[PDB]
Amino acid sequence: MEAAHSKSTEECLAYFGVSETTGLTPDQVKRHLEKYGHNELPAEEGKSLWELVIEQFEDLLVRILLLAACISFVLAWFEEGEETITAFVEPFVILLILIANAIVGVWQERNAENAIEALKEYEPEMGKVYRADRKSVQRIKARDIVPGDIVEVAVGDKVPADIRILSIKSTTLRVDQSILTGESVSVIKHTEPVPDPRAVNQDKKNMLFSGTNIAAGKALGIVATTGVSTEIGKIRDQMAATEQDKTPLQQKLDEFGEQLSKVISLICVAVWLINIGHFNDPVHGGSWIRGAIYYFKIAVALAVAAIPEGLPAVITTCLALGTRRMAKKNAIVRSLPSVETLGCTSVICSDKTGTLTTNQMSVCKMFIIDKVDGDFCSLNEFSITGSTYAPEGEVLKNDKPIRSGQFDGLVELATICALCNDSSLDFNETKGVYEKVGEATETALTTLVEKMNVFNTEVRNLSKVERANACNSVIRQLMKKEFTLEFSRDRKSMSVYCSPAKSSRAAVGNKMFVKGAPEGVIDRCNYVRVGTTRVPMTGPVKEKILSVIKEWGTGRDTLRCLALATRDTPPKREEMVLDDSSRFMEYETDLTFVGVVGMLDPPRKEVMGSIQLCRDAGIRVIMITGDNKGTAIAICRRIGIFGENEEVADRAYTGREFDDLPLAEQREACRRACCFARVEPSHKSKIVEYLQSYDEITAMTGDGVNDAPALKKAEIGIAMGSGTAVAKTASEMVLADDNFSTIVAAVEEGRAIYNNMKQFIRYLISSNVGEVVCIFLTAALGLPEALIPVQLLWVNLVTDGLPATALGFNPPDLDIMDRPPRSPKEPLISGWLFFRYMAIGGYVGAATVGAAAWWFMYAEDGPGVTYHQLTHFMQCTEDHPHFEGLDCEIFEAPEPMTMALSVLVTIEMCNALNSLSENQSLMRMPPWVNIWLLGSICLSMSLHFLILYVDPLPMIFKLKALDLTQWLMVLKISLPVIGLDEILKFIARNYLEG
Numbered sequence: 004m005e006a007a008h009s010k011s012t013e014e015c016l017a018y019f020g021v022s023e024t025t026g027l028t029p030d031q032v033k034r035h036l037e038k039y040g041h042n043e044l045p046a047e048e049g050k051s052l053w054e055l056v057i058e059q060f061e062d063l064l065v066r067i068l069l070l071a072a073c074i075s076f077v078l079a080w081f082e083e084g085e086e087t088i089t090a091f092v093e094p095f096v097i098l099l100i101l102i103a104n105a106i107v108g109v110w111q112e113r114n115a116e117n118a119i120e121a122l123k124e125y126e127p128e129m130g131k132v133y134r135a136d137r138k139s140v141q142r143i144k145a146r147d148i149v150p151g152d153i154v155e156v157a158v159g160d161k162v163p164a165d166i167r168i169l170s171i172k173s174t175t176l177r178v179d180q181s182i183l184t185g186e187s188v189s190v191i192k193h194t195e196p197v198p199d200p201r202a203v204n205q206d207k208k209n210m211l212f213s214g215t216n217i218a219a220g221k222a223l224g225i226v227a228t229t230g231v232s233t234e235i236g237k238i239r240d241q242m243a244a245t246e247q248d249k250t251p252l253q254q255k256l257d258e259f260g261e262q263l264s265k266v267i268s269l270i271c272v273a274v275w276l277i278n279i280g281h282f283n284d285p286v287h288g289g290s291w292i293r294g295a296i297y298y299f300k301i302a303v304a305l306a307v308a309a310i311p312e313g314l315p316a317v318i319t320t321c322l323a324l325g326t327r328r329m330a331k332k333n334a335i336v337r338s339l340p341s342v343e344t345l346g347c348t349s350v351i352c353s354d355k356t357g358t359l360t361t362n363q364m365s366v367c368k369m370f371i372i373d374k375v376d377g378d379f380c381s382l383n384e385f386s387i388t389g390s391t392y393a394p395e396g397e398v399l400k401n402d403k404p405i406r407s408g409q410f411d412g413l414v415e416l417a418t419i420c421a422l423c424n425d426s427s428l429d430f431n432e433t434k435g436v437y438e439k440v441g442e443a444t445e446t447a448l449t450t451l452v453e454k455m456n457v458f459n460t461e462v463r464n465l466s467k468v469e470r471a472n473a474c475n476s477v478i479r480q481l482m483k484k485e486f487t488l489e490f491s492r493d494r495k496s497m498s499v500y501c502s503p504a505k506s507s508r509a510a511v512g513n514k515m516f517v518k519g520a521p522e523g524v525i526d527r528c529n530y531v532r533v534g535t536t537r538v539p540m541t542g543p544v545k546e547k548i549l550s551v552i553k554e555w556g557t558g559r560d561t562l563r564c565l566a567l568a569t570r571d572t573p574p575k576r577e578e579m580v581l582d583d584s585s586r587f588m589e590y591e592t593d594l595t596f597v598g599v600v601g602m603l604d605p606p607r608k609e610v611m612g613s614i615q616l617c618r619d620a621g622i623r624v625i626m627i628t629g630d631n632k633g634t635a636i637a638i639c640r641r642i643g644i645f646g647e648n649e650e651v652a653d654r655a656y657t658g659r660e661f662d663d664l665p666l667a668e669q670r671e672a673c674r675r676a677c678c679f680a681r682v683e684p685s686h687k688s689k690i691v692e693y694l695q696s697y698d699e700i701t702a703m704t705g706d707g708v709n710d711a712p713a714l715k716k717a718e719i720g721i722a723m724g725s726g727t728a729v730a731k732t733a734s735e736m737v738l739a740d741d742n743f744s745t746i747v748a749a750v751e752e753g754r755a756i757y758n759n760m761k762q763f764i765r766y767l768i769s770s771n772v773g774e775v776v777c778i779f780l781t782a783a784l785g786l787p788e789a790l791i792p793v794q795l796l797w798v799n800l801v802t803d804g805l806p807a808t809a810l811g812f813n814p815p816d817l818d819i820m821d822r823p824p825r826s827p828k829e830p831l832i833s834g835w836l837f838f839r840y841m842a843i844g845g846y847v848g849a850a851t852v853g854a855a856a857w858w859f860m861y862a863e864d865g866p867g868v869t870y871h872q873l874t875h876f877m878q879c880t881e882d883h884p885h886f887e888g889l890d891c892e893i894f895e896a897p898e899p900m901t902m903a904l905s906v907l908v909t910i911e912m913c914n915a916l917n918s919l920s921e922n923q924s925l926m927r928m929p930p931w932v933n934i935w936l937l938g939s940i941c942l943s944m945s946l947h948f949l950i951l952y953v954d955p956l957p958m959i960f961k962l963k964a965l966d967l968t969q970w971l972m973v974l975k976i977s978l979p980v981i982g983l984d985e986i987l988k989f990i991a992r993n994y995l996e997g
């Protein structure tokens with residue numbers, strides 16, 4: 004129905020031929036599903052694989068090797084005919100390592116995207132509809148919604164399709180439509196039609212757009228368009244502007260990447276400058292311009308060898324890996340920095356009802372007034388059986404099933420629960436279980452009314468569906484609901500104005516049925532109902548009431564209590580303004596107490612363990628709830644936040660007590676207290692903000708709309724999968740499984756990702772530095788060249804490839820969740836850790852020039868035995884005072900250079916074994932703890948063995964095979980790099996700080 008906002012409510016109902024209070028017939032739905040199809044979208048598109056590869060070649064560090072591979076290809080056209088084959092290989096060596104990391108990235112990305120979509124599509128989105136099938140509102144899939152049927156939405160709900168508002172069951176309806184219209188602050192909706200058909204979405208103040216959320220209130224409406232025809236569906240199939248952005252940690256690495264890109268660039272020019280005197284050497288035989296190209300090729304090859312290629316890829320791989328690992332644990336990671344932030348998290352704030360608890364409400368206790376003397380007050384307490392939402396239970400007075408209608412106080416109490424109620428009950432035919440429609444606290448009352456068959460309604464012959472709201476519907480037909488004063492958390496109560504249905508209670512007058520937190524409701528009571536009579540509220544009576552609240556609340560069941568009262572003589576209907584909810588409390592004054600219900604809400608089993616695990620990781624868990632302080636503390640003890648006998652007078656505050664404190668004292672209380680109760684949504688964010696003033700990484704956990712500000716304020720917001728759509732929208736991570744332990748796993752994951760980045764850097768730096776100091780050592784001591792540009796590239800492919808990337812798959816340390824979180828002030832590289840780089844780099848650099856000099860001197864079977872003549876090897880051409888009389892071109896042998904190349908590769912493969920942890924020993928953390936690394940080392944090692952023995956290869960790479968004795972020398976020098984870092988690991992762990 005195009006331009007349904009233009010037509011009135013009456014014209015929209017007749018447009019599809021629907022009854023407003025009834026809904027579509029089962030035959031109408033069939034025709035509309037055939038005519039309009041399902042309310043869904045063709046899954047948009049997805050990340051193209053061709054575009055998934057092009058992202059691997061966008062970073063600076065990768066693009067550097069990009070320009071290098073091109074230059075080496077261009078310079079290959081200036082190569083002489085005799086030495087062609089060697090030149091063509093150079094750019095392929097540079098390009099192959101880029102593809103190697105590109106494959107791992109795209110592969111890991113695909114697996115991450117699949118795990119996410121396999122979790123997003125797991126749980127189907129539902130919507131509340133009114134149809135001729137059932138009397139009460141039923142729950143159906145959003146995909147089966149069609150224009151026509153009447154749809155109900157309340158606070159926190161997500162609008163399924165484009166809805167034309169028929170009636171607003173609240174005094175105000177505010178809608179969060181920032182996802183469409185862009186406007187942040189919630190907007191007010193009305194039922195009046197907008198005459199302009201060409202009006203914008205912002206002018207459609209009677210329409211409810213799909214994908215948006217209801218910030219406040221509750222309305223009833225008819226669907227206008229579904230599927231692609233939706234106003235948000237028009238831009239979904241085209242305007243797909245992604246909200247992709249690099250994480251803070253990713254930006255910290257890219258900053259460090261350019262930091263190295265400058266330093267390496269400097270030391271590469273430093274190579275080309277200290278070798279200007281070799282531009283006119285007989286080794287090249289070229290002019291002063293030809294010899295400059297060779298050492299220029301060295302600088303570029305040394306650059307490629309030094310420049311981290313996997314760094315921009317391993318961070319994307321680890322991030323994607325974390326996302327998949329969270330999707331595995333049924334956790335929707337809405338924002339990429341979610342995992343890494345929970346690693347830094349020091350404080351986790353959390354809502355109580357629905358978050359820390361299962362939100363499976365059931366009334367088990369209730370009491371009314373029995374007898375009131377001058378100072379004596381007795382109560383008629385009752386017990387209710389049944390933990391689920393099924394209308395199956397018994398009211399027990401002294402272990403005896405009693406008739407609810409016998410007690411007049413129970414009649415009024417049940418009346419209140421059914422009338423002062425926006426939620427209902429619906430039976431699921433598929434699962435065979437009664438499901439709530441709306442708030443769990445309210446539905447608990449709905450099931451109570453059904454069990455409290457007050458008017459003795461025949462229900463034994465009703466189906467499971469009809470049994471759901473049978474007794475409730477009865478009461479609704481007794482009093483006409485004029486209007487409702489929605490539940491507000493400042494007043495902490497809800498009211499409903501009712502008039503008689505002109506039948507039985509017609510000769511009485513209007514009434515208001517109030518329901519809310521015991522504190523406020525009782526304070527606003529001036530009388531108490533004794534059956535049908537009324538007596539003034541006094542001291543002893545008020546005290547007796549509250550005493551039972553405290554009992555059930557702080558008891559072993561920790562009951563969520565709720566007071567029920569009525570205003571016998573309400574103000575005139577025309578003397579009440581419904582524009583401001585601030586006046587609603589005054590309308591709920593001069594009340595008369597009727598009774599109190601107490602419902603159990605069992606805490607999730609995985610909570611107590613999680614809090615203890617958080618405590619081991621040095622993470623505080625603060626409960627912030629709007630519930631009673633007595634209940635809040637009692638539950639804190641049950642989940643481990645407080646001791647069973649711990650004094651909590653200094654560690655637990657109400658919103659009132661918290662406000663009485665000076666601002667400076669409020670800030671101090673947040674790092675002290677762990678339990679805040681009777682708190683407004685403003686307090687939750689205020690507490691979070693207070694913790695952030697101490698520069699602590701704060702997380703928020705919740706499910707309701709009252710958590711949204713704190714979820715936005717915190718570093719990372721975690722919503723319950725069974726929570727509201729509002730809470731999820733304001734979150735960075737959604738727990739679909741509602742598993743609290745998944746939060747702890749996300750913490751470990753974040754700490755693991757950060758640690759893997761450290762060992763990745765710890766390896767790639769300490770190794771590449773050794774390559775640099777090796778080149779400078781030869782030029783400093785006077786020894787001949789150790790490596791050629793082609794050999795430099797080969798080391799790069801073999802050492803800075805998969806053995807580096809595999810470190811992103813390292814296991815977490817043995818004490819990763821037994822150590823306090825990393826401070827935001829902590830730098831990327833410690834001063835001690837930088838010494839670690841030079842200590843290893845210095846050895847492996849001198850271990851390479853030492854193996855090359857070993858072949859010249861100490862080598863026995865190795866052809867060529869000299870002493871202290873390596874320093875002066877360019878003299879024998881013109882002078883040979885101490886030379887034995889051997890060949891004058893022995894210093895250009897490929898054998899000693901192959902020794903240096905062999906050690907350089909091997910000693911880095913060993914160095915990668917030291918990159919399984921930071922301070923943990925190689926014995927405590929065995930080398931077989933990472934199979935992915937060992938598989939990369941052997942592949943790199945074997946690929947090096949091919950280059951030496953496969954006939955055409957060592958000629959191209961200018962190498963010669965090593966004897967079995969020569970390899971033993973390689974291992975003799977390479978292997979003790981393990982012991983060096985082992986000592987360094989022993990110092991930091993024991994003599995320093997473990």
Ligand SMILES: Nc1ncnc2c1ncn2[C@@H]1O[C@H](COP(=O)(O)OP(=O)(O)O)[C@@H](O)[C@H]1O
Nearest residue numbers: 356444490492495496497518519520628629630
């Ligand atoms: N629908 C409702 N109608 C009336 N009172 C309510 C309703 N829901 C909750 N309350 C009362 O208001 C108090 C505050 O609720 P809220 O601030 O949402 O957090 P919590 O439900 O965790 O207490 C509750 O303790 C409850 O007694």
Ligand code: ALF
Nearest residue numbers: 354355356628629
């Ligand atoms: F525990 Al709540 F809103 F559900 F404070």
Ligand SMILES: [Ca+2]
Nearest residue numbers: 307308310803
């Ligand atoms: Ca490199």
Ligand SMILES: [Ca+2]
Nearest residue numbers: 770771802803
């Ligand atoms: Ca290297």
Ligand SMILES: [Mg+2]
Nearest residue numbers: 356357629707
């Ligand atoms: Mg709540």
Ligand SMILES: [Mg+2]
Nearest residue numbers: 356357706707
């Ligand atoms: Mg909640």
